[PDB]
Ligand SMILES: CCCCCCCCCCCCCCCCCCCC(=O)O[C@H](COC(=O)CCCCCCCCCCCCCC)COP(=O)(O)OCCN
Ligand SMILES: CCCCCCCCCCCCCCCCCCCC(=O)O[C@H](COC(=O)CCCCCCCCCCCCCC)COP(=O)(O)OCCN
């Protein structure tokens with residue numbers, strides 16, 4: 085069969101020939117493209133032995149930084165624009181549906197199940213925010229059996245997993261919308277968010293002259309039987325980082341207003357225990373039938 | 375700063391513009407080439423959300439499989455031909471030295487320091503082999519203060535790094551050559567080597583219809599003051615896998631003969647405890663001046 089891999093040209097030709105053995109058509113195509121690009125990158129850059137070693141070390145450290153609650157490989161994808169590119173290709177603003185946005189590294193399915201009026205945030209975790217809307221079809225009809233996975237930074241600038249003690253989740257939950265599609269829950273106003281700088285991605289951003297900021301945002305991931313899954317986020321207006329999100333997640337249609345309500349009776353009705361005032365985020369979620 | 379990342383074209387243009395912030399000129403060039411290739415790969419393949427997820431999972435698992443005894447990221451580089459391509463670019467044969475070959479995943483930082491006539495292998499680790507030669511410059515000058523880091527599979531087809539109990543290293547050592555460049559040590563005859571399939575790389579080889587075999591080989595990593603470090607391997611002739619090395623390491627100039635020697639006096643002189651026959655591998659190492 086194949087000649088000894090004596091030269092760069094032969095190494096590439098041999099590896100490309102071996103792609104033929106991949107049985108699955110799609111995986112074969114992906115592998116052909118991967119080899120082509122990997123080999124071109126190495127040849128075009130004349131990657132040094134030391135640069136290769138450093139790359140091995142970085143990728144290893146990236147994987148080793150990952151836990152069930154912090155995905156450093158997602159974060160790497162995010163800061164290099166891969167995550168946003170995949171999102172744009174896969175979820176084109178195609179029907180009248182709420183637009184898609186990046187997941188990011190801090191999603192977990194270890195979040196509490198909640199009914200409407202419950203809170204995703206413990207007390208003393210930031211300025212009160214109430215989030216509400218209806219889950220609707222593009223035809224305007226209510227969507228039953230919808231669940232909203234939602235998560236955010238606390239008002240102090242940290243996701244729950246970035247603290248040393250996590251005895252329970254915080255500033256996240258799985259909210260079950262009602263039969264008429266209505267959802268409503270307590271939360272806190274999210275703050276401009278500095279991406280964690282204590283792993284390989286932080287080092288990459290420093291070495292490449294990048295800031296590490298995301299604008300304020302609230303993740304919204306919605307599923308319902310009969311509808312396409314939406315992964316998205318709302319971005320409160322007026323944040324100085326909206327036009328320079330480090331992970332390219334902001335879209336104009338996902339920028340939202342917050343309205344302040346200073347009515348102690350209303351705050352208590354909504355379940356806020358320390359009363360006073362809250363900011364209101366009212367926005368429907370529009371899903372596309374499957 | 376930049377327009378909202380609303381489309382795939384804008385995402386890529388924004389990321390490429392941000393590469394300009396990288397201060398180091400070489401790192402800037404590498405990042406720009408990396409972004410270009412990553413983005414092109416995603417667009418050319420229309421990579422799906424699920425395929426992205428699966429890739430994140432694979433890369434994470436690969437990093438988490440890595441230890442001081444097993445470099446799964448090196449193995450991944452190896453099976454995709456990247457390692458061999460880097461080897462060829464960085465040690466072009468025109469310089470006149472011994473050719474490079476793949477490091478592989480089983481180099482360790484704990485090999486014993488040894489002197490000429492010592493063994494890298496405990497008893498009952500395979501058939502006896504003696505390795506010898508002289509370290510020379512391309513210009514002919516003998517090289518003082520050279521060390522030969524050498525490692526190989528045991529005669530059952532496993533590196534010490536694969537053992538559940540590894541109280542000491544085995545079938546590896548750092549042999550200090552003499553002032554005149556001469557080295558000599560006892561070893562075992564290397565056997566055809568099956569790459570362990572219990573990590574991500576094994577799954578990748580299965581999914582892509584590949585075998586997991588390397589021909590018999592003895593790693594040789596030679597360092598000396600005033601010379602370029604050589605990372606190479608000798609490949610005994612006659613092995614059925616030489617023509618289909620899974621990691622593209624074999625080069626005709628690195629294929630060696632082994633002499634069968636039945637000479638009891640010589641066997642004892644060379645330090646073989648049981649005497650009897652041994653295979654002799656005699657090959658000089660030619661290093662390139664800095
Ligand atoms: C098939 C499509 C593409 C194929 C062709 C391209 C692939 C080649 C693979 C990468 C090869 C070299 C990468 C170029 C490095 C440029 C980085 C310049 C800045 C710099 O040196 O930063 C340091 C090293 O970072 C680094 O070494 C960062 C490495 C980044 C690799 C990212 C690979 C893509 C993965 C992203 C996720 C995508 C998954 C879904 C596709 C930061 O570190 P330090 O030196 O300060 O500290 C020590 C480690 N902690
Ligand atoms: C440095 C760049 C880092 C990111 C890569 C840039 C481009 C992104 C590529 C994404 C798409 C992958 C393209 C090929 C398709 C996969 C191969 C087909 C076979 C297949 O699906 O294999 C499964 C998944 O493998 C896989 O998912 C294999 C992914 C391999 C990508 C590695 C690229 C880096 C090469 C290493 C070089 C080191 C740095 C030096 C420059 C085997 O797995 P399974 O399905 O059994 O279960 C795995 C969980 N364990």
Ligand SMILES: [Fe+3]
Pocket residue numbers: 188190236237277301303
């Ligand atoms: Fe977030």
Ligand SMILES: [Fe+3]
Pocket residue numbers: 478480526527567591593
């Ligand atoms: Fe080996």
